[PDB]
Amino acid sequence: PMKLLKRLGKKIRLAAAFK
Structure with a gap:
């Protein structure tokens, strides 16, 4: 489901932006 x-x-x- 998209939501x-x-x-x-x-x-x-x-988590991607974290590092």
């Missing part, structure tokens, strides 16, 4: 992919992507991109 869940937002929640998934948020953690992924946050």
Whole structure:
């Protein structure tokens, strides 16, 4: 589901921006 992919992507991109 797209709405869940937002929640998934948020953690992924946050970790991406982290470093």
